[PDB]
Design a protein around this ligand. Structure first.
Ligand SMILES: *[C@@H]1O[C@H](CO[C@@H]2O[C@@H](C)[C@@H](O)[C@@H](O)[C@@H]2O)[C@@H](O[C@@H]2O[C@H](CO)[C@@H](O)[C@H](O)[C@H]2NC(C)=O)[C@H](O)[C@H]1NC(C)=O
Ligand SMILES: CC(=O)N[C@@H]1[C@@H](O)[C@H](O)[C@@H](CO)O[C@H]1O
Ligand SMILES: CC(=O)N[C@@H]1[C@@H](O)[C@H](O)[C@@H](CO)O[C@H]1O
Lengths: 531, 531
């Protein structure tokens, strides 16, 4: 019997599994229950702590994926399937996973906590590309990842109601963070050194924990990859959340008014029925918009993330933030006219103008005209390749780059130490077409050291690159500074705006996260919308 | 006795001119030909009356008086400003024109160039040394005409709808002079079926207004617009604002209700008293705005120049347009905070933001914020040299470059053959400081061949350059094409947007009259001002 794989946590005993890596073994504890199953009458409600159990929980395999929409845009295509659920769907999904070195550390080891993305409508801690074994072996951290409710189950909100308060998927994350505080030392992890990191909606979640005081005491640093809580997609107002929740009820045959009866009827529906109507509550056809996201109702978030990012004192915070080179390209094939992964997507000017309304939904004609002004090359107004690149820039700037740049500049100007990057390496194995460049999400496999898997086809240079990135991230987790005793990564400041490029070449320091474009999204466009 | 070449009979009667010496040979000049009854006393503010015939011989042997006008005192005794100030006595008795012709007079009908001076509709005179027609006539063997027209209140005070002060009478002075050319120029050897108007700044705006006014349009065949356009935001005024300014002027000088009585009171005021109060009627502190300018009242202009340009059919028309390299710089020392000819004018960010409101007067705060967004380099938001250059661009783009580009693009798209230039040579004799670059107005001396004056010190290279520009201009007047019957000058079109640089080097073809900036001024900002 291997005592290294036996752990007692507060709720009882666990049995883990020893895994192989090219660098040697790691200990894994997969599918640890951290909440009571949010089933039946507990659907839409805040999570409750898992009650203690007798016997030994088998923690040798991933647990179920929280109920979510499954992408069918390109069936069987690797570029989309790698994000789809790779376990059975269930509402009984509140489990988390712990990877540690083997044998288990006997000195407090720094902890990384991963929060997956997926637009708050999808995602799972069990995805191959989030496999924690390489990071834990190479950099000797403890890695934790949790499942949290997505879609209606995590973020349907009738604000003011007790039956569907909203943001319970964020409380799922919070409960997992409290679980880490109480139990991670039993695995050799150090609860006084917890670094959150996440990508896209996971990065937005990280930012929301930064801005919510009950979460702030549960971790010490933050990494936001390709996402930010002030993204135009990351939160919804109370009025629009109520309208969406009420339209969902109508689409699945539930009354009307009274929130108690509405939620009671929703609780009688099979989970898949709610999933099947999720996208139809959005106000218009769009890309980069999701139906059920965090709601600003004064509780988890006392104000908009934007407002909270402006009012906060962030002295004592270190954050690592960044984007990929081509944030918008992946999102365009989900509704922008004329786009497809299977051709060059050389759109016409008419398609470009239509795409602006799809990629910047729910703004006035005047605001759309302002976008067209800034993103048109008026010496080549109709060039298809430039139009393709421009609309990719519109979607990536508006949704990712400029929200990240605003967060970075405000935090730095208000006392945080900020490191910024742009990830510029296109994986040799990438299945998406060349015109998409370095698409959203394709730095994750390098951060997690997936190239080290000998059963994959990465190059020798890409494995060295992966090791470099794992070292940056773990250096930051350990000290708040990614650098080592080699060209240096300088902090990002509101004035100098310095960031580094991450690719196969040594670090290159550059200035400005799309400064001209982001001045339009962050400084001028808000004035236009309110006047 | 008499030189037959210097005696000419026109409708009013007989004239006697002078034989002018030029470096290349003799020229005949008829200076100070009366073309209207003097607009004195009861005739102030009224449309021009045609000159009544006379017996005997009128000596047209020297320039007549400058129309009463403000005299610039910003830099007393400074060549760069004094060269534009009156060089003859001021008088309301000023409606005279000038004819230069080859000596001896042409045997066969000769193309006519008609010059309209600028000066913002508040100043200017056909007698300025820089408008000396003798070198053009001798070098290129055309007939050159220039006229004086009323400026300031005497030319453009308007109480719209009134009989006493209808407005635009300064434009009718120009028109009457063009009718005089049609009826009389053949007696000097000129060809009334080949008349090319050219003008600079307000003179270019005037040329464009004649293009857009049917009664003027039949009086000429081509047009040259140098650094000005009738759709400039300074070049016309609405009926209500013209009335407000005229009423304000009257109130400031003691007058008085019935437009008849108020104009009667204004007529009793000494001319200098009106001039002394002219700048006080502007609604705010500004640069590049002038109190009394053409009014859009449905008569001379049946609609705004913009609407007429957009609705016009311009087949059969050839036009030559252009700008100098630094249109804005000269205007900034007349009120932009921090600007001076006598220092480097390296302004702060605060002075830049203040300067935007001075250079873009009477727009909403949102409009001003849009200007700030477009002209700020957000990687160098506070760099003095960049801010100085940016404000120059603001004032130049808004008032000159973008109105000219809109005119050129719309005329080219609607059937006209357009040629475009940017003038990029800074004269070796220029007295303005180096930071002003190639300022507004400083192509004129080269177009008129002033470097060929023996008493001036231009370089030999500048004389060759002057000769080449005279050749372009006269080629265009003769044929509608500046090219020689050799780098070629391609027509300007709305798509390719080709223009040539004019400097000491051979012609260089470029694309875009500040296309990215002018898309903001010409396409987006009007939408913002509406909504
Ligand atoms: C550059 O000069 C401007 C203009 O000031 C005038 O010209 C100067 C060269 C100098 O001779 C001054 O005495 C003149 O008044 C300066 O802007 C002016 O600054 C003064 C005093 O600070 C102020 O009273 C005026 O209102 C300012 N005028 C304007 C148009 O803003 C400017 O400070 C000089 N820049 C420097 C010093 O580099
Ligand atoms: C008061 C009014 O409507 N207009 C009058 C007009 O009748 C008169 O001809 C003119 C001359 O005094 O004065 C004004
Ligand atoms: C600038 C101008 O008008 N002409 C002068 C000329 O009188 C003078 O003799 C010369 C230097 O000798 O410099 C030049």
């Amino acid at each position: 019997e291997d005592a290294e794989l036996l752990v007692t946590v507060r709720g009882g005993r666990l049995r883990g599994i020893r895994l192989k890596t090219p660098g040697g073994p790691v200990s894994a504890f997969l599918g640890i229950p951290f909440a009571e199953p949010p089933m039946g009458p507990r659907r839409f409600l805040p999570p409750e702590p898992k009650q203690p159990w007798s016997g030994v929980v088998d923690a040798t395999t991933f647990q179920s994926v929280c109920y979510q929409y499954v992408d069918t845009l390109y069936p069987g295509f690797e570029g989309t399937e790698m994000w789809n659920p790779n376990r059975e769907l269930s509402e009984d999904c509140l489990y988390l996973n712990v990877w540690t070195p083997y044998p288990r550390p006997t000195s407090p080891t720094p902890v990384l906590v991963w929060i997956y993305g997926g637009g708050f409508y999808s995602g799972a801690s069990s995805l191959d590309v989030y496999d924690g074994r390489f990071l834990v072996q190479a950099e000797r951290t403890v890695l934790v990842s949790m499942n949290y409710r997505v879609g209606a189950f995590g973020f349907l909100a009738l604000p003011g109601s007790r039956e569907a308060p909203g943001n319970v998927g964020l409380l799922d994350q919070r409960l997992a963070l409290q679980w880490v505080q109480e139990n991670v030392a039993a695995f050799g992890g150090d609860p006084t050194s917890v670094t959150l990191f996440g990508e896209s909606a996971g990065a937005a979640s990280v930012g929301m924990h930064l801005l919510s005081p009950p979460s702030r005491g549960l971790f010490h640093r933050a990494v936001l990859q390709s996402g930010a809580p002030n993204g135009p997609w990351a939160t919804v107002g109370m009025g629009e959340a109520r309208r969406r929740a009420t339209q969902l009820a109508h689409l699945v045959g539930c009354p009307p008014g009274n929130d108690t009866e509405l939620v009671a009827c929703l609780r009688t529906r099979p989970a898949q029925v709610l999933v099947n109507h999720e996208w139809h509550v959005l106000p218009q056809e769009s890309v980069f918009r999701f139906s059920f996201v965090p709601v600003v109702d004064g509780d988890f978030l006392s104000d908009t993330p934007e407002a909270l990012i402006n009012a906060g004192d962030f002295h004592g915070l270190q954050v690592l933030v960044g984007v990929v080179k081509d944030e918008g390209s992946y999102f365009l094939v989900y509704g922008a006219p004329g786009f497809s992964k299977d051709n060059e997507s050389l759109i016409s000017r008419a398609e470009f103008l239509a795409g602006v309304r799809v990629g910047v939904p729910q703004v006035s004609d005047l605001a759309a005209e302002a976008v067209v002004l800034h993103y048109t090359d008026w010496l080549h107004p109709e060039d298809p390749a430039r139009l393709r690149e421009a609309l990719s820039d519109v979607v990536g700037d508006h949704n990712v780059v400029c929200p990240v740049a605003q967060l970075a500049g405000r935090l730095a100007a208000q006392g945080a130490r900020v490191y910024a990057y742009v990830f510029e390496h296109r994986a040799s194995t990438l299945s998406w077409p060349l015109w998409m460049g370095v698409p959203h999400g394709y730095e994750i496999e390098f951060i997690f050291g997936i190239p080290l898997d000998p059963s994959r086809n990465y190059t020798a240079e890409e494995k060295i690159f992966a090791q470099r990135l794992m070292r940056y991230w773990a250096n930051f987790a350990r000290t708040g500074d990614p650098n080592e005793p080699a060209p240096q990564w300088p902090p990002y400041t509101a004035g100098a705006q310095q960031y580094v490029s991450l690719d196969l070449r040594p670090l290159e320091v550059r200035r400005g996260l799309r400064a001209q474009a982001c001045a339009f999204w962050n400084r001028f466009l808000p004035k236009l919308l309110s006047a």
